[PDB]
Amino acid sequence: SQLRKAIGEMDNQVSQLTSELKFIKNAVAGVRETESKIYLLVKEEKRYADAQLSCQGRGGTLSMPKDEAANGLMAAYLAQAGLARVFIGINDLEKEGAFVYSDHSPMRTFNKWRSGEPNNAYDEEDCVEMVASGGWNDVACHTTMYFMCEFDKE
Amino acid sequence: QLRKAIGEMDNQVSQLTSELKFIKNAVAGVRETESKIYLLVKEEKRYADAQLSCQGRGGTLSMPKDEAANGLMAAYLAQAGLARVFIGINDLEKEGAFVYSDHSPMRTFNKWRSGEPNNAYDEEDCVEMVASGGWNDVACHTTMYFMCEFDKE
Amino acid sequence: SQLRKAIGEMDNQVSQLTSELKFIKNAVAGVRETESKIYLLVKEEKRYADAQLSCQGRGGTLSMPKDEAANGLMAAYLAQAGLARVFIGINDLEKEGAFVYSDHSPMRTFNKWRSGEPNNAYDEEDCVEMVASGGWNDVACHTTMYFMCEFDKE
Ligand SMILES: OC[C@H]1O[C@H](O[C@H]2[C@@H](O)[C@H](O)[C@@H](CO)O[C@@H]2O)[C@@H](O)[C@@H](O)[C@@H]1O
Ligand SMILES: OC[C@H]1O[C@H](O[C@H]2[C@@H](O)[C@H](O)[C@@H](CO)O[C@@H]2O)[C@@H](O)[C@@H](O)[C@@H]1O
Ligand SMILES: [Ca+2]
Ligand SMILES: [Ca+2]
Ligand SMILES: [Ca+2]
Ligand SMILES: [Ca+2]
Ligand SMILES: [Ca+2]
Ligand SMILES: [Ca+2]
Ligand SMILES: [Ca+2]
Ligand SMILES: [Ca+2]
Ligand SMILES: [Ca+2]
Q1: Is B46 exposed, middle or buried (0-12, 13-18, 19+ CB in 10 A)?
Q2: Using beta carbons and an 8 Å cutoff, which residues of C are at the interface with A?
Q3: All domains of chain A in start order, with CATH
């Protein structure tokens, strides 16, 4: 029974690592995870194109809320982090009025525009922000703020 | 046959432990004792908010119950280049009677600055740590960065 | 077959940790890794000596580009991170004109000095910066900017 205890201690090591890893994910990086996706808040004030490049560098894109569950998760994430606004992956940069997600997939029936939005304010708003409530608002791409990236587990 | 398989697994866990240790120390710049982990949160908050934030992370505001802990926190504060942070000490329930965040009572060990605690203007029921490592009572509604503490259960 | 499943599940745990660890390295910390080394950008404006101390506290040193591959990696890292300049581990602090790496190992034939560099401008330039292009330039040690640390895998 020499290997028995070596392996018991091994189990302990793996348990330990799992716990510390979970800690790093939750307490430090404050990440958010679904069954199929990971969501990450980056607390660096940037402009839209810079943000999309930063998300891409991390091997992801700006977050795309295509359904209620995602959007609600993002809203909760924003809530706990205690922020008013972040960039997300929606824009009508190519064709004004025609909004699309960061991956170029077209806009659909689901949305979360705040009342009166999108309003293309001063004909200079082609990017999209999410606010505390979870609602969307179009804003100027040259605006600078924090952002959220989205990752596929593939 | 099973021995070398186990050895190779040992190698894998060694590897993972090392990379994880790297992530903890070099990247996240956290601080670790044999039994505890300490984390600086650089978000300006009021005391109760800070404590809630620590709790949400499954911890509490840092409790320096001995010299080693306190000195560690002081060094951490030094490296981060900060003047003050909230820590887990208060006399919110009974004025003059200080306690740690986990409600465990105050002891002989302390690191009060000269003249502290002074309950300035009868509105100071929370505690800050400063660069030197000394303590000071301050108003709970004050807003600043804070330090959380985590047990390795 | 009770032990079989416990072992299978532990295996799953180790695979899982491997993936999540890789994620934390790449997506969160945005580090760059070679077979033998890890490179880390620190986004805190500091002076050379402070930067070196910070790297040391992390158990490393300021980055040392001793060959073309390293230097090019550092350059790409800088580029994507969207930075103009960072400190690196090169200086002639001890003996003017005689440049050395942070680990005190002497300068060699390989270099990436910009045109006209190093020029010891106003006899007050004893530290080295890397710029977007990947080129080197000597600068005053009292200058404040971001820096890059380098780590051995042992
Ligand atoms: O900075 C002013 C204001 O800008 C944001 O909203 C702008 C625009 O996108 C809205 O459609 C209209 C409607 O009120 O107002 C602004 O032009 C908001 O995010 C707001 O919080 C911000 O203060
Ligand atoms: O703007 C040119 C250059 O300025 C700074 O470099 C200084 C010095 O170190 C250089 O040797 C000389 C070359 O003429 O110029 C300056 O005095 C750096 O900030 C550099 O990035 C910049 O391109
Ligand atoms: Ca427009
Ligand atoms: Ca528009
Ligand atoms: Ca708008
Ligand atoms: Ca009081
Ligand atoms: Ca008091
Ligand atoms: Ca006081
Ligand atoms: Ca000189
Ligand atoms: Ca010089
Ligand atoms: Ca120069």
Answers
A1: middle
A2: 10, 13-14, 17, 20-21, 23-24, 26-28, 30, 43, 80-82
A3: 1-154 (3.10.100.10)
Residue with tokens 């007050």: C124
Element (H, E) at C8: helix C3-23
CB-count exposure of residue B8 (10 Å: 0-12, 13-18, 19+):
exposed
Which of A10, A19, A28 minimises the CB distance to B30? A28
Chains that touch C (3 or more CB pairs under 8 A): A, B
Distance spanning both ends of chain C, measured CA to CA: 38
Using alpha carbons, list the distances in angstroms from residue B23 to A42, A121, A144, C60, C101.
18, 44, 29, 13, 25
Q: Is B112 helix (H, G, I), strand (E, B) or coil?
A: strand
Please report the DSSP string for C139-151 in residue order.
E-TT--EEEEEEE
Listed residue (B104, B88, B94, B2) closest to B38, CA to CA: B88
B118, two tokens: 């002074």
Helices within chain A (DSSP H only):
3-23, 48-57, 68-81
- A145, A93 Cβ separation under 8 angstroms: no
Eight-class DSSP state of C123:
G
Q: How far is CA B151 from CA A50, B16, B74, B136, C10, in A?
A: 39, 21, 19, 25, 24
Sign of CA dihedral B74, B76, B81, B82: negative
| Structure's resolution in angstroms | 2.9
The alpha carbon of C9 is separated from its chain's Cα centroid by a whole number of angstroms, namely 38
